[PDB]
Amino acid sequence: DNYQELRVQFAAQAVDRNEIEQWVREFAYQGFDARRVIELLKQYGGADWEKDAKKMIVLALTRGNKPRRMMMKMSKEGKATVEALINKYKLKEGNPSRDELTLSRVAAALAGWTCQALVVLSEWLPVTGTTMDGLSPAYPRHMMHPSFAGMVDPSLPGDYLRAILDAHSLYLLQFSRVINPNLRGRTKEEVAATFTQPMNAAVNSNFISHEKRREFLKAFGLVDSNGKPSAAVMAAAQAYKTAA
Amino acid sequence: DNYQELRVQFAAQAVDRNEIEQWVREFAYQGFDARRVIELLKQYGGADWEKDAKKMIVLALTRGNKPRRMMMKMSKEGKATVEALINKYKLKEGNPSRDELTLSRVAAALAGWTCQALVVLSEWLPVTGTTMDGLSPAYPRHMMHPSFAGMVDPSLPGDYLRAILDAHSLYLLQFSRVINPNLRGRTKEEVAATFTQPMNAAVNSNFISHEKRREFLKAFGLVDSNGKPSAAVMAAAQAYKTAA
Amino acid sequence: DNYQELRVQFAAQAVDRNEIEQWVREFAYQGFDARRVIELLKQYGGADWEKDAKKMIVLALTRGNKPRRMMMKMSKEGKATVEALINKYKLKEGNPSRDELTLSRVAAALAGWTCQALVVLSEWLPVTGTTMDGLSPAYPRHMMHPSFAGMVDPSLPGDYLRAILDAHSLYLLQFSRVINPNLRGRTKEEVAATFTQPMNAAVNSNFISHEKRREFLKAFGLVDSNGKPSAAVMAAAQAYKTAA
Amino acid sequence: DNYQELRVQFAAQAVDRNEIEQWVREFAYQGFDARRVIELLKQYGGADWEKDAKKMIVLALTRGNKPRRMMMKMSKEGKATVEALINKYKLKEGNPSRDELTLSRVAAALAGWTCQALVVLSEWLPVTGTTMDGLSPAYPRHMMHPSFAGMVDPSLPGDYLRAILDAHSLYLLQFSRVINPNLRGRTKEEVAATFTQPMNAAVNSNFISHEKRREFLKAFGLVDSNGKPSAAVMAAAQAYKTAA
Amino acid sequence: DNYQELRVQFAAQAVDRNEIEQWVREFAYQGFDARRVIELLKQYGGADWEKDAKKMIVLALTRGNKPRRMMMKMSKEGKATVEALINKYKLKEGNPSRDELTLSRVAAALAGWTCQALVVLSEWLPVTGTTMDGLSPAYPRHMMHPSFAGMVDPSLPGDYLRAILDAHSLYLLQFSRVINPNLRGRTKEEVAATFTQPMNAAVNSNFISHEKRREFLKAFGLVDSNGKPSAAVMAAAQAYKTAA
Amino acid sequence: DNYQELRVQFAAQAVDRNEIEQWVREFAYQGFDARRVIELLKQYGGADWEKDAKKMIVLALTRGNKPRRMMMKMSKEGKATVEALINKYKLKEGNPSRDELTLSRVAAALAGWTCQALVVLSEWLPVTGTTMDGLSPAYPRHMMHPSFAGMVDPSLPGDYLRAILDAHSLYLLQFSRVINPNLRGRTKEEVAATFTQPMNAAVNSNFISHEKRREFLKAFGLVDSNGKPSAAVMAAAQAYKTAA
Ligand SMILES: O=N[O-]
Ligand SMILES: O=N[O-]
Ligand SMILES: O=N[O-]
Ligand SMILES: O=N[O-]
Ligand SMILES: O=N[O-]
Ligand SMILES: O=N[O-]
């Protein structure tokens, strides 16, 4: 019938904030699917899934996300362990489908442990805690993996949240440059453009509730009882502002 | 068979301004066919077309115009929703025939609702309202999509019309550079050349009467009862004049 | 027999100015073949050829030389008209053979009318008359298409002819930049190099006699009874000298 | 089988300057075989070869050395003429075998006429006489083709010869850059390296005796009765010295 | 099937420093498998393996790691020798499996001899001893191959160890740029990132005991009886600090 | 058995200077094989080999190393001579196998004569002796071919040897630029990098003994009875230092 009238009638319909925001979340960029990662770990791993996941996290943090490549530069024993992990958990490189595991995904799905492991693994990461201390004193080790974004409570007060993300970004700037010998022709802003979408996706995901995320941030020593960031976090956020 | 004479006699024929301008309008650039878009929505969607159209507008404004691509990085629920929408509405990408739907066409055909939805969607757009506010105070959220051009009454007094279009162009300028990173190095003038044709086409189209367009402008708070643009529009029109 | 003597005997033959110059003309660069264009229009079009040619000229001036592309961004009605024109006149894009019509060729073959149409179509061209007025006051609208080169009488006095071509070139510089987002790394001289060969070919063609061409230039208000260019032409030629 | 001894005895053998220089002349660069070119013209052309050769020289000087390419942008009459010439003379492009004709070879073999034709063809060459006049007053029109090198008497006194060749090189320098746009950024010295071999080859070739070459130079007004270069040559030789 | 809870319980599990560091060592980068290399040499070579290994080390240090490529530019005798070595030892290029020999692996596995051979091979290396002497006086010849890292005792006092490794890195810095010309434009820090992993891997490997490594350092004159680095090492460690 | 002990036992083996240096020589870069060149010349040429080799040397020096290409720009007679040489000696371009002749290889294998021929061929080389005199007075003609490196006695005193190679390098810098219109974006050091490996290979080859090489250098007037370079050589070496 009358198309102009239909458009006009359509414009007169409610602009429902609760409804729209639900769709935004449902349709938002998702870098990885944590619930599917953990389901697949439990599926492939049975009783061994927890111990194997810790190994895989150590592999992700100290060797990276390419299982077949790291095998080419590894001890005979280590290589056999990794081959057995690839075979058991059907591990892939890069960004495969939802139904496929990667080392990075295991690390991100279980970031509550990953971030703690970083306290131990500091001197073996692509960028060491020693280096980070040179940019910002007592740089929080818990922030030293892309996984950490899954620990950030997005409901923190505007300035606290910003401090946390800025402080984390200081690491992300260094890390991205080290793992990519191509971001040489890249400013701070240009490097950020490649890391903030996966960062923000994890910050805003529905995996681990806001309260549980903040509890982790508190237990890690990154915020106090009110969500105010620690001295170290404040220092690292300040360093990000003046970093290039 | 005297061709020079034929060329000459052809030159002696009336240059009828009325007849030629009618041909200009017939042949003019058209970005989309709003009437056909509504018809196709009504056709494919039946009783669900209205709710589906809103979802499709939210997708268009927050994720873009490529339904297959966005699905690769999305929650399981959202991926299922978009898949079904693709199958139900035979969604395509880019600029197919008038007999085919895209996400951008849905938002353009139903601009009256799209522009109200921008108020809610502000923080989630490729260029946020907060970013717009740094260029021009309280930038009108209703102007923050190419769709807005379909709400502009071309019968507005010259200076009021130009103010509306200049204010809108301030957004178009930022948005075009974000969506097409290869326009970052181009001048305002050059970027304008890439958005001006679809803008003017929607401004001057026969879809939705001038009187209804103006009443949307009045309802949105963009003009007053006497056709005069608000302070926010004037501010934004001035920012566009001195923008780079 | 003796090759050296044959070359020497050959060198002793007349260097016939009338004969050589005839060969130059016969062998010169020809961008399009106006007589073949008009023959094909009359062939394909019958009684409708004159009206259709005017439509095609309007299409060429306001949409360009790509019939299948412009159809993708056009009203349903306009698109059906163009499809019928393509089918009837076997229209092609770019530079096909002598035996093939294009919109550009129709415009150039009938430049006596095309140049007059420009007075009407000014504000709808890729570069508007408004813009040209910003570079040179009262810029002659008749000069605002590559077609105009077919109107230039090459027997005009050296300085008058130069003024006409310089004034036209001011437009050609702007036009070439607008239709080619590649001549960004191009100086005035570099842009000229791409437009002067088609310009000069048409200036020197044997289609429309020198006297008839000058009559057009006079009727257009571009020269007086002695071939002296108008004030507007003189201004535009001066602007070309200092343009970059 | 003592190879060092064989190498040694080989070194002890005469270095005969007369014998070696004879080998230099046998093996020297030859740009074209003038005798064969005339023979082929006479063969393919019969009674029409002289008139056809002149047309071919006009083509070579005003359109270039690619008969198939030039045909694509030419009048109907001219296209038919070139087609027939291609078929009658089996014209080729570039540098085929000595048993094949090109347009450039015809002009080179018949340089005595080619160079006189330059007087008439001046405004229509890739570098015009008027352009040459801006570099050196009254630049000799007879020097404005690579063909001219075949008219140079190498037995001229050193300083006269060098003046003729320097004056000619002024043209070669401009012409090489026009014909090969990728030489615009190169130094005079570098451009010289690209034209000097065919130049010297024609200067020193056995086609047309030194005495007849000199009498052409005298007839052309390039040298006087005592072998001395004209003012125009001297001027042009000096302009080449200080050219970039 | 509560995945958040599973993630949470996983986070509550011990972060056992001893257990995690054991996993780091298992999974650590390994450049080559020295034990397997010797086994393969002994296997393929029988009674000739020792003499063949020395030839292979000389090839590695003076020609590189690509046996097929070097053969193309070599004396007849040498080409025959390398061909036979390739056939006898099944030599490969690059980084194949642990069950395959390369020239570089032979030199690395047998580093104690390789490093002594550098004294003799000095003038014939890609970076000569004389060049090293210009950067740091009497640069230790024993350090002038990546192999040297396998002679470094990691149990040396921190400052002595670092001095040995810094002195060695001065060579690694020059050598990496010569071998990979695309590293000439990179910073010291960037070049270091390309040599540090295989360096540290050999430093910390379980092949050859710390005590035997140190006694090689003492025998080579690189440290004294009290573990202290020689003047030459200290000089070279200082040159690395201020190197670009 | 015990791999660590085997490596340690291997390190305890002699580092035999005489033995190692023999392997270096056997394994060194070889650009061409002079003994194989001369054997092939004698094989293919029989009684005509010596005269044909002189022709081939003249061809190499005045036309280059591409027999099929030079034929395309040559007299009928010269071309037939070269075709007969290609057929008889199975000549190739570039760097084919040991068992294949090239013009360059004939020139280098017989450099004792080649270098003498250069005194005659000076003004016909790609870079003339006249040009070289402009860079360094009385530049030694004998040095004006890559072949000359086969004449250099590497046992000359350090400073004399360096003078000889520097003086020769002055030519090599000019020559490499002239035969390669790509080394335009190349410094002196960058050009040297392309010519020193073939230079040094020939300087250090075992073809023609040190004493015989020095005898040639003496007979050429390039060194005196003690091996001290002439004035001309000293001048040319000095010019190389300050050349760019
Ligand atoms: O990318 N979703 O954490
Ligand atoms: O082309 N916009 O209706
Ligand atoms: O290009 N001939 O008008
Ligand atoms: O090679 N010119 O006769
Ligand atoms: O990985 N070096 O033993
Ligand atoms: O490259 N051996 O002379």
XYZ file of C-alpha atoms in Angstrom, chain D residues 4-244:
241
model
C 98.823 -21.837 -16.968
C 101.515 -22.218 -19.641
C 98.867 -21.948 -22.391
C 97.527 -18.778 -20.739
C 101.135 -17.478 -20.495
C 102.078 -18.220 -24.146
C 98.775 -16.630 -25.173
C 99.840 -13.486 -23.284
C 103.227 -13.416 -25.099
C 101.484 -13.159 -28.495
C 101.401 -9.854 -30.380
C 98.811 -7.288 -29.460
C 98.433 -6.072 -33.056
C 96.705 -2.692 -32.987
C 95.767 -2.844 -36.710
C 94.277 -6.353 -36.404
C 92.370 -5.559 -33.188
C 90.902 -2.278 -34.507
C 89.713 -4.116 -37.621
C 87.867 -6.481 -35.261
C 86.392 -3.503 -33.396
C 84.887 -2.211 -36.671
C 83.556 -5.649 -37.633
C 81.852 -6.112 -34.281
C 80.744 -2.510 -33.725
C 77.174 -1.546 -32.846
C 74.988 -1.071 -35.913
C 71.590 0.548 -35.394
C 70.206 -0.378 -38.806
C 71.252 -1.781 -42.191
C 70.577 1.066 -44.641
C 71.400 -1.014 -47.752
C 68.985 -3.784 -46.807
C 66.252 -1.237 -45.912
C 66.413 0.345 -49.385
C 66.432 -3.106 -51.012
C 63.310 -4.147 -49.064
C 61.550 -0.856 -49.947
C 62.347 -1.377 -53.637
C 61.273 -5.035 -53.363
C 57.927 -4.632 -51.578
C 57.022 -1.290 -53.143
C 57.871 -1.595 -56.837
C 56.938 1.604 -58.685
C 55.282 3.077 -55.551
C 58.172 2.733 -53.080
C 59.265 6.405 -53.234
C 55.845 7.904 -52.466
C 55.203 5.218 -49.812
C 58.603 5.898 -48.210
C 57.732 9.598 -47.805
C 54.392 8.737 -46.143
C 56.283 6.326 -43.886
C 58.779 9.057 -42.963
C 55.933 11.461 -42.111
C 54.380 8.723 -39.929
C 57.723 8.062 -38.199
C 58.352 11.742 -37.419
C 54.824 12.736 -36.339
C 53.339 9.539 -34.843
C 56.241 7.189 -33.956
C 57.477 3.661 -34.657
C 54.411 1.542 -33.760
C 52.096 1.284 -36.808
C 49.455 -0.927 -35.124
C 49.191 1.347 -32.072
C 48.893 4.654 -34.008
C 46.073 3.162 -36.150
C 43.836 2.934 -33.058
C 43.736 6.749 -32.869
C 43.568 8.075 -36.411
C 41.100 9.156 -39.104
C 39.403 6.450 -41.204
C 41.415 7.460 -44.325
C 44.739 7.454 -42.458
C 43.952 4.137 -40.800
C 43.293 2.569 -44.221
C 46.572 4.004 -45.591
C 48.660 2.659 -42.666
C 46.939 -0.755 -42.810
C 47.819 -1.059 -46.525
C 51.417 0.076 -45.840
C 51.724 -2.557 -43.084
C 50.425 -5.244 -45.475
C 52.514 -4.108 -48.493
C 55.819 -3.570 -46.640
C 55.362 -6.070 -43.785
C 56.141 -3.322 -41.285
C 57.135 -4.333 -37.760
C 57.755 -2.548 -34.457
C 60.918 -2.110 -32.357
C 64.127 -3.811 -33.521
C 63.435 -6.934 -35.619
C 65.892 -8.674 -37.981
C 67.725 -6.813 -40.777
C 65.302 -8.437 -43.221
C 62.355 -6.498 -41.721
C 61.204 -2.884 -42.213
C 60.190 -0.386 -39.525
C 59.111 3.251 -39.922
C 62.227 4.467 -38.074
C 64.507 2.447 -40.380
C 62.962 4.027 -43.495
C 63.610 7.501 -42.053
C 67.170 6.521 -41.058
C 68.076 4.924 -44.408
C 66.728 7.933 -46.286
C 68.107 10.582 -43.907
C 68.871 13.103 -46.661
C 65.154 13.551 -47.320
C 63.966 13.031 -43.712
C 66.117 15.955 -42.520
C 64.725 18.313 -45.203
C 61.190 17.226 -44.258
C 61.854 18.382 -40.658
C 61.742 21.992 -41.935
C 58.070 21.441 -42.853
C 57.219 19.040 -39.995
C 58.669 21.276 -37.247
C 55.466 22.238 -35.334
C 54.244 18.624 -35.452
C 57.274 16.836 -33.978
C 57.324 15.547 -30.348
C 59.728 18.399 -29.626
C 58.826 21.365 -31.811
C 61.236 23.770 -33.483
C 59.730 26.587 -31.403
C 60.697 24.701 -28.215
C 64.213 24.187 -29.606
C 64.440 27.945 -30.353
C 63.925 28.682 -26.647
C 67.014 26.633 -25.836
C 69.149 27.858 -28.733
C 68.173 30.595 -31.231
C 67.224 29.444 -34.740
C 67.976 25.800 -33.869
C 68.724 23.969 -37.141
C 65.556 22.135 -38.129
C 67.665 19.612 -40.120
C 69.124 18.202 -36.877
C 65.779 17.396 -35.260
C 65.741 13.617 -35.777
C 68.098 10.739 -34.857
C 68.329 10.200 -38.667
C 70.493 13.311 -38.871
C 73.485 11.358 -37.532
C 73.726 9.614 -40.949
C 74.453 12.970 -42.570
C 77.492 13.723 -40.383
C 80.913 13.533 -42.016
C 83.321 11.972 -39.431
C 86.330 13.235 -41.397
C 85.454 16.825 -40.425
C 88.096 18.578 -38.281
C 87.761 17.530 -34.630
C 86.316 20.797 -33.352
C 83.858 21.181 -36.244
C 82.668 17.579 -35.907
C 82.206 17.933 -32.151
C 80.244 21.173 -32.658
C 77.878 19.450 -35.113
C 77.411 16.499 -32.740
C 76.976 18.689 -29.639
C 74.389 20.823 -31.436
C 72.545 17.674 -32.527
C 72.801 16.239 -28.976
C 70.899 19.267 -27.618
C 67.891 18.000 -29.571
C 68.556 14.320 -28.741
C 68.555 15.257 -25.059
C 65.047 16.857 -25.204
C 63.614 14.253 -27.590
C 64.782 11.211 -25.565
C 63.060 12.541 -22.441
C 59.774 13.204 -24.292
C 59.754 9.760 -25.973
C 60.800 8.009 -22.722
C 59.116 9.858 -19.813
C 61.184 7.770 -17.360
C 64.300 9.751 -18.360
C 62.981 13.093 -17.048
C 64.710 12.550 -13.695
C 68.044 11.471 -15.216
C 71.121 13.664 -15.795
C 72.265 14.902 -19.219
C 75.175 12.461 -18.983
C 72.772 9.580 -18.287
C 70.427 10.513 -21.149
C 73.481 10.859 -23.443
C 74.381 7.228 -22.684
C 71.030 6.175 -24.207
C 71.393 8.078 -27.511
C 75.163 8.111 -28.124
C 75.542 4.545 -29.493
C 73.065 4.779 -32.382
C 74.266 8.362 -33.013
C 77.955 7.384 -33.376
C 77.035 4.249 -35.356
C 75.313 6.358 -38.053
C 78.106 8.970 -37.954
C 80.721 6.320 -38.696
C 78.767 3.966 -40.944
C 79.848 3.160 -44.503
C 76.512 4.356 -45.956
C 76.823 7.551 -48.036
C 80.405 8.779 -48.560
C 82.064 11.376 -46.323
C 82.185 13.751 -49.293
C 78.436 13.388 -49.978
C 77.652 13.704 -46.256
C 79.649 16.932 -46.107
C 77.927 18.284 -49.234
C 74.571 17.616 -47.539
C 75.846 19.557 -44.489
C 76.868 22.413 -46.804
C 73.559 22.270 -48.737
C 71.596 22.259 -45.443
C 73.520 25.394 -44.343
C 75.102 23.581 -41.352
C 78.708 24.084 -42.494
C 80.312 26.497 -44.945
C 82.691 25.704 -47.859
C 85.632 25.388 -45.463
C 83.877 22.816 -43.251
C 83.115 25.396 -40.553
C 79.831 25.072 -38.590
C 77.300 27.894 -38.854
C 76.455 30.341 -36.057
C 73.258 28.339 -35.350
C 75.271 25.124 -34.811
C 77.846 26.900 -32.630
C 75.039 28.444 -30.537
C 73.440 25.011 -30.124
C 76.762 23.332 -29.308
C 77.252 25.913 -26.525
C 73.708 25.421 -25.181
C 74.420 21.664 -24.918
C 77.561 22.328 -22.852
C 75.566 24.169 -20.165
C 72.343 22.141 -20.444
C 70.910 20.029 -17.609
